[PDB]
Symmetry: C3
Subunit: 545 residues, 3 copies
């Protein structure tokens, strides 16, 4: 119902006139054939209604082809405009490329808000199905993406920012879609996209086959060089393997991503790897892979991020229901240091031998982390213990456990190896907070720790029994409950020593009701005994009172 | 295509005629200007289709203004009707108020079911965008809400019930929307709303700026005086602070709310507080705040509810990726008493010094809580231990640990202070269930507990060694494994005493294979020894067999 | 606008002509009455737009009745076709049966893809509302289902596969719907459906009442004989009880289901039982039932599946906010064996006395499970311990703990009873992995285990003190720290024995700094002492160094 030689011209009349909605009909009213468009520019929120369907087939409703050498089909842009376009989009339309190897894009959207593409299809072209730049508050749900992309293509791209880092893709919904038989990133972002608040939820993703342009490089279904707040949840992912068009992993996150990215509750089938996280804050939990026909269990994320990641296992069940990869078996009470709070920015780095492969690097004269003491432990009658797994970068790293600026205990850290460092807190020393600091001259790598109440404390002390005549005895200095535990001692172990105590009868005498004691050592040999021991030790048990 | 002076009159003709769908056109067919409506009443399910968009702008599709002094624009009601209206609503329409300070509402819906408002906009007015009363099975997804509300306004209100408490808002979806630049409650409910089964999922909420009518009182984005079953999940919330139009918190729940409310997996940016929960059952987990430009870490929920809340921390990450607020460090094995089952309704109350600030008040002669014993522990060879954190309201509270009506152990509770109370269960005493009861005369406040297996038990017993001649010895009464642990004893600690044992040689003699024993005390001084001790104690170790 | 006697004929003209969209009008243009259809066949993706609503009422928009003896109303099929139909469906239509007891179906869909049914209603008939066979990539959201089904009926059925097991229902969305007042399965699947990637999310389900055809057998709201990947999340379920039309449970999963099924974050009101799981991998968490007016707390799932299930409690809160059923109290560190990985398929089976009622059956000469040792424990200075709960099927089952093919410890398993079996790993024995194997001649049932670090090890050794003269002494053989713990010993308990040690003074002499020791036993009686003991034992304490 508009004037011009071709559909490209017919439609441009509507735009110049500036009509709000432009209904388009099926393949019947153009006799079996799809209206062809090319390089059309739309500078206002125009709706393009259809009478077509989400689907592959081109024989039964609105269908659109790109023109033989066109760069794009539509480009919904607000560039140079004085009022940002806000609305419209594609509804009920089977969009298509000119050839199966055509490059460029199908839809561009630039300098836009509240774009929507419902119940459509994007297919057959080796470039990008949808290219977004400075597109906000939009929605792309209920579409098909098929035979898109390749070395210079993909499904949906979040492109560079337009001018400021804040001129980005944000508040975008990608829901209820189906992606199959594609190449490149199926959803992706550039090194300068800065995207934020993205929902990728309740989609199907499945290999199906290699399209016209196979992948040339190792590829990822979801490939985001940058990504801030994102929900990637309740999706299916099916048959992504290296041999099936080089999908080496499901998700890759780039080194300058911020997060928080939530990769949760996805149900995978015969996928080779969760993928690679090189940056950002990423939370992964509730993911399960049925290995199906795959020859190997799914691989877990490779993590090299400089920031906290919380990556629970993707469970691997074989097709017969047998678990072959379960939850990670953590040390009881283990906490990775990056989960704790602290006053200094400390980048995480990779160490193959860390419990999670992710460890903090803490310079000289710097806090590691600080935490609050549980209220139940703060009763003046609780002994606590810190075990921290650490590795010196070089000689001379020292870890101190402190209550604010008060120093409770220090340990020298061995260079080049992971070792466990134990610090006790006496009951009379525990306050509101504890911290670990590097008080040495070299970097220390800090893996994680175990903090909690203990029902004992180990105690070692100086003795000097010397040379004892037949039947003579030596009594050790008094071991006060104050110095031993900082609170009442319930009882002690048999004492042991820094050497043999051959021919000494040993017992323990209480010196108060509160479990203070001496050790008595008596020459039971019947002739002169030259002793050699200089240290005595017990395990001291604590209860309450 | 209907007869009358103004649009208000034109449209009423359609309603009197009772047409099912009333299509409305863009700003082109009314020459740049939006059809104005006022006080229209709709008593049947009428659809009002449009050719407009979710968006701010008013220059490119269906657009509607309210008339200069109208109370409402539309009021979809079934009041006085004999068949409840079931269907219709607003589609593809940019709805608007007459002025930026106009009060009243834009849409009222009353005595209704299956109302829907898709792909529209609600904006520029200081009253309520949508006011719902007795509205069931409805859906409001894919809309914009902007420059709404103020002291007497807001986005969506769930109003009082119509007649019975069951004449309420229920089974309502609020999804895929965008809320920005508003005042009052952005979604809210009255003290008599009684709402149930509400989805507020995958929305954006962002400050953006102060509208025409700033807030006059401390405000909350989500403000629900009443709320039963609710999903508040997978939302963005951005820049809600006191200085930015007095958003002191994200969520407030009123004292008479029932729950269960799920506040989960929301991604916050530069928000000041999660808010305030004064009632209901509320579950919060998986929430994370990037502090961004905010000068302070987000504050956690303030909880004063009389009912169980499970509030995991909102994690605070700084813009550089550093955790400054992590997961709460709980005592190992801690369980808040309100998570346990029990036969008596026990209101929770606030105590700043409780592990979660929430504690039970248990009157005289009342059960605290009862739990099932794990099957693995019920082998006749397991010693268990209960530590419970408690505070007397006044003198004379007593806690008893029981197996049904059998009393295992009692402790007097100190008034006015939090203390840890330890109860052992001997291996021959453990059955199907345990309970803690107040068997005293005053209220006890119960914080939480730690229940589990132990590998030792502490034992204290009467002795009377008296006055021993040179070389004489005293042997304690037999300490049976039955009385000590209720099962085989593996071994014991060195014995300790209620006073000094100067000059006594002490050893232990087994009296059976099953670890029953006596303690032997021999005068090693060579003259008369007057002993002073009256009690002996050990830690007894248990294994199996 | 098509030629024929009745609507059945009028519509068939459109299909023969092969029109893409067939708009249908309201009850006004057919004078109060609904267009009646019967046995219509649709072999191409045809859209059927309406001007009606999701709703019960039939007086205000597009409404359709089935013809008096019709088997179906529509049957969207691609049977015999050469291009699979891909698209179209029902939009804005109040579909209905001829009578309230009519059997058969309302909609059939067969050999189809990308079917959609938005904003409609399915009601009043005793057969199936929607019957799906080989239907892929479809969507059924925003509908009502009411007064459907009975002994031969229900809401949505996933029928048998068409030819191959891969010709099934898959990638189907069921969202935003309302189900009420129905009989049979409200959503269901056959013994040969093989469905995969099904979303049942954010629906209301509520009893409301018994329809025309009550249930004849014990019924389930969700009844899936087969089901692979499924999201069943964020739903309401209300008043499903035996007395309210025999809804004995919410979910039943059949014996040949594969999973993974996620039953998570559903909010129940006055429901009697979560239901019955007889197969598949099923994950249940975050579900809560407000008991409301029900006389009993909800019952938990009954589990008889041959595969791993992770079933966290459905929490039961009474209407006053009191927990009456809380989280399951598990033994600390408990892991069900089916959560661990292993090299052999081991079917799970029911045992009422297992911690989760689900236990593995492990034949003779077979691995139970194998796990990785935490990195923090692999420092050559950590003693670990395995406690496993086991029951012999018959005499002669044996459990071995191994490091690969090296055997660390073996225990004989008692027939017919559950007992706890303890295995220590010395510090010098711990490598990369541990495994438990059945090395006996009978089946063993394996419930679960507790694995972790310990700070002690128990040690028992041969002694032969014989007959001692007055004042004579016996010294035990040396107890090396290598044999005791495999690492330095900190200290030991008082020694105990396999019998009485009447008249023996006992002490301990260190034989090295590393906690190796002998026990000294001296005749303190003053005449000949015939000893009877042959074994000595200690608890040995370990720290580090």
């Amino acid at each position: 119902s508009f004037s011009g030689s071709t559909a490209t011209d017919k439609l441009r009349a509507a735009i110049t006139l500036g009509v709000s909605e432009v209904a388009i009909g099926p393949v019947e009213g153009n006799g079996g054939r799809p209206y062809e468009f090319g390089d059309v520019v739309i500078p206002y929120p125009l709706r393009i209604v259809g009478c077509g369907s989400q689907g592959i087939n081109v024989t039964k409703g609105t269908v659109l082809k790109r023109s033989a050498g066109a760069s794009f089909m539509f480009h919904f842009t607000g560039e140079g405009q004085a009022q940002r376009p806000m609305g419209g989009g594609l509804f009920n339309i089977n969009l298509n490329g000119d050839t199966a190897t055509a490059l460029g894009d199908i839809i561009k959207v630039t300098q836009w808000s509240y774009f929507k593409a419902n119940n459509c299809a994007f297919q057959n072209m080796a470039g990008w199905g949808i290219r977004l730049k400075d597109v906000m508050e939009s929605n792309i749900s209920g579409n098909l993406f098929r035979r898109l992309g390749g070395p210079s293509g993909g499904g949906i791209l979040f492109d560079d920012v337009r001018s400021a880092v804040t001129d980005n893709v944000n508040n975008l919904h990608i829901e209820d879609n189906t992606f199959a038989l594609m190449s490149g990133p199926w959803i992706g972002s550039t090194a300068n996209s800065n995207p934020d608040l993205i929902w990728i939820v309740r989609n199907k993703f499945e290999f199906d086959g290699t399209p016209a342009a196979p992948n040339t490089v190792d590829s990822y279904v979801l490939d985001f060089q940058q990504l801030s707040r994102a929900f990637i949840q309740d999706n299916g992912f099916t048959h992504f393997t290296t041999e099936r068009n080089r999908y080496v992993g499901v998700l890759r996150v780039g080194a300058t991503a911020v997060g928080t990215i939530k990769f949760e509750d996805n149900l995978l089938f015969a996928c080779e790897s969760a993928g690679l996280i090189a940056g950002g804050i990423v939370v992964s939990r509730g993911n399960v892979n049925n290995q199906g026909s795959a020859t190997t269990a799914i691989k877990q994320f490779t993590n090299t991020s400089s920031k906290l990641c919380k990556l629970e296992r993707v469970i691997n069940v074989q097709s017969n229901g047998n678990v072959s990869v379960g939850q990670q078996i953590l040390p009881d009470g283990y906490i990775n240091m990056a989960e704790l709070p602290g006053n200094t920015r400390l980048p995480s780095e990779y160490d193959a031998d860390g419990e999670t492969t992710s460890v903090l690097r803490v310079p000289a004269n710097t806090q590691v982390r600080q935490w609050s003491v549980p209220k139940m432990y703060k009763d003046g009658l609780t002994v606590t213990k810190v075990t921290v797994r650490a590795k010196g970068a070089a000689a001379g790293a020292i870890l101190s456990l402190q209550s604010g600026s008060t120093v409770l205990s220090t340990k020298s850290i061995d260079a080049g190896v992971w070792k466990n460092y134990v610090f006790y807190v006496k009951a009379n020393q525990l306050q509101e907070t504890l911290q670990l600091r590097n008080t040495g001259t070299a970097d220390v790598l800090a893996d994680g720790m175990v903090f909690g109440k203990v029902d004992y404390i180990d105690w070692d002390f100086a003795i000097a029994p010397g040379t004892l005549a037949a039947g003579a005895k030596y009594t050790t200095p008094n071991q006060s409950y104050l110095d031993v535990a900082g609170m009442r001692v319930q009882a002690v172990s048999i004492p042991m020593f820094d050497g043999p105590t051959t021919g000494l009868q040993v017992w323990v005498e209480a010196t108060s009701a509160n479990g203070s004691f001496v050790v008595v050592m008596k020459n039971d040999t019947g002739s002169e005994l030259v002793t050699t021991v200089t240290r005595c030790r017990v395990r001291a048990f604590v209860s309450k009172g």
